[PDB]
Design a protein around this ligand. Structure first.
Ligand SMILES: [Cu+2]
Ligand SMILES: [Cu+2]
Ligand SMILES: [Cu+2]
Ligand SMILES: [Cu+2]
Ligand SMILES: [Cu+2]
Ligand SMILES: [Cu+2]
Ligand SMILES: [Cu+2]
Ligand SMILES: [Cu+2]
Ligand SMILES: [Cu+2]
Ligand SMILES: [Cu+2]
Ligand SMILES: [Cu+2]
Ligand SMILES: [Cu+2]
Ligand SMILES: [O-]
Ligand SMILES: [O-]
Ligand SMILES: [O-]
Lengths: 278, 278, 278
């Protein structure tokens, strides 16, 4: 494999994070005051790393940080039940851990933390975060196994109720690549609706990484993926492979949802910077 | 592997079962008169066993027994069409069979019966059992393969329309374990809604057993699983592994269903019997 | 394997296809004027084949051909955006390509095209084909890998909104087989609803082919599959294997949908041509 690959983990990492009310009524996470985004920033770590997140709630209401997939003690589960949220103006240090897979004392096989995960609020509006999630308090988390193939770029597409990344209908987002780039999609669903994520001109493997290990990998190959509230998956594709440059649609294939605006463009450019037909 | 494992099957087994109207209007199965439950009792067998169920309908309406996954002849399919239901006060012997996997005459591979299955009524209210299922006429079936790892306890969680196990909203059920136990969950969905099953602090393999065979198993690891009417899956987790004791929520992650009461607690205790915070 | 298997592909193939308004208001595809069907005709090819489709729109509105899974250039994506629909009475030649899996320059493994795919309209009624799809402009596409087991017959079941193959409620379709036949189902969902496809008496592997490769295939075995708009899977079963002849129901297991008509019969006959009870 002459492609870049993930190294072995085991670092202790530190991170400051804020929750911020945005001028338009939304709420968003950020690594710096004044730089919050919806989706929130991407967190990426290696199996076996530990992450300490000093989280500050700059909002006028209680807020929290709850994560999927990774190891965390009950003091870091981000629920009010377990006294794990943060009052207005407060600050709390959450700890997430990850581990490599391996053999248990009893001979069984313990799975590792690697995968396409996510984090979101758990106490704004209700004790399940219905208000925070709706306002934009969600973001992606990636845990890499040693040897995993690394991309040229990562993009995050979140189906939040009937919007993509909390955008107005029929406003994308759109992404650009050049034929040949190795592009990574992290795909997360939130809210109360069910969807199917479809991408013209490309396909991926329905397994942890989106890639086949080789001629023996039994994972099915798909271009349409059903998803419900709090599902998360990811894949990599070679932009334009076998199909060439173009304005390639991605959307929810639910005919009502795409009619209502859940559509965007994956713009794959020729080497001269152009898109066939434009 | 020094954990307990399932033995090879091939026994002929016998069982008495009743359907019973409950005093509150619900309907349930049981192995003894006066001891019906919702969910009905768990039936567990080994690939290759045969099960003869003498089923007695003690209700004032027709009722039946329909099973997923296992081999049954058309006389045991539990539909009114094939004249397989049971008149009020009547009795009928259903036969379910299971087989091991193996090579067919043509060289192809016949799959075995092992899996997490379920049984439910097919004629109460409509000819698809909409009334019986609504009332509580459903229960889990587990078929084990030789060598499967055996748990310390098994619990059944059924999303029935917008309830868990037909309970009133926000009334559990809750389960208890001690840090370290091998806990097995059978997860079944019924009715007319779609859900996603999420469990704080734990994860599992999205394959038949919920466990990885080893370093070569391509199965993805998840903590959130989409499910629709009559889907059934199962898994095992080590209670508290890598995360410790605590009151860990499980729920449907659909924000509307969560807010409406589809929540419960998986209470993992320290050895002294306590739960951090209580 | 002394069953029939797919050969290696690589042919260039040609096809004439029409879109046609039906006397009852529906629309459908066909290989011959006067012979359109809903679902449209099955297209089947071998990994590595190329397919040239001369498509003629005989209707009084724009129509197109969009396909899942296969390789196509942006000129053949069937969207109005990319100027690849067909005006009334017009003709256009779409090109679909497929490739075998294999090792990329960087050492990664490129997936092949094989699978259970489908084609449908993209511009009738809306720019996502909501009108064409609802009217009947959809059909199945099968791409075989060298070595794949071949069936005795293939049937196409499409859950389109709350109909099967656009039929009136409780009107099938029904299919007939004889105990022992190798039967292949192609299962496609369209519209705005979610379903679960269930088949009495039979089960299949939840992977690309529906079949297990042998003792090491980790794929789970199911008889109930959740599906949303534009999902497509397929499988093979041995009619009556281990369960015998009979009138076996298949349906959507959503209790509302089957009460409302989404039911058909898979009639498995004894060698004398009869069905237990009829
Ligand atoms: Cu939660
Ligand atoms: Cu959608
Ligand atoms: Cu498409
Ligand atoms: Cu969550
Ligand atoms: Cu049924
Ligand atoms: Cu739910
Ligand atoms: Cu969680
Ligand atoms: Cu059922
Ligand atoms: Cu499209
Ligand atoms: Cu349905
Ligand atoms: Cu059934
Ligand atoms: Cu499509
Ligand atoms: O599409
Ligand atoms: O959650
Ligand atoms: O059923």
């Amino acid at each position: 494999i002459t492609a870049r690959t993930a190294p072995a983990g085991g670092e202790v990492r530190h991170l400051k994070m804020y929750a911020e009310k945005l001028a338009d009524g939304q709420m968003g996470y950020g690594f710096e005051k004044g730089k919050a985004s919806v989706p929130g920033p991407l967190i990426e770590v290696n199996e076996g790393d530990t992450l300490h997140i000093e989280f500050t709630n700059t909002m006028d209401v209680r807020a929290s940080l709850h994560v999927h997939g990774l190891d965390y003690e009950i003091s870091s589960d981000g629920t009010a039940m377990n006294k794990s949220d943060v009052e207005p103006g407060g600050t709390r240090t959450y700890t997430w851990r990850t581990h490599k897979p391996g053999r248990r004392d009893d001979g069984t096989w313990r799975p590792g933390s690697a995968g396409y995960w996510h984090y979101h609020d758990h106490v704004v509006g209700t004790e399940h975060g219905t208000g925070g999630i709706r306002n934009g308090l969600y973001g992606p988390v990636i845990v890499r196994r040693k040897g995993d193939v690394l991309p040229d770029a990562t993009h995050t597409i979140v189906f939040n109720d009937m919007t993509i990344n909390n955008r107005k209908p029929h406003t994308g987002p759109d992404f650009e690549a050049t034929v040949g780039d190795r592009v990574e999609i992290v795909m997360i669903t939130h809210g109360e609706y069910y969807h199917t994520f479809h991408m013209h001109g490309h396909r991926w493997a329905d397994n942890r990484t989106g890639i086949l290990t080789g001629p023996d990998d039994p994972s099915r190959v798909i271009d349409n993926k059903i998803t419900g509230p709090a599902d998360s998956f990811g894949f990599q594709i070679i932009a334009g492979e076998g199909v060439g440059a173009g304005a390639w649609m991605y959307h929810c294939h639910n005919q009502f949802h795409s009619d209502m605006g859940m559509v965007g463009l994956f713009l794959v450019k020729k080497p001269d910077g152009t898109i066939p037909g434009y």
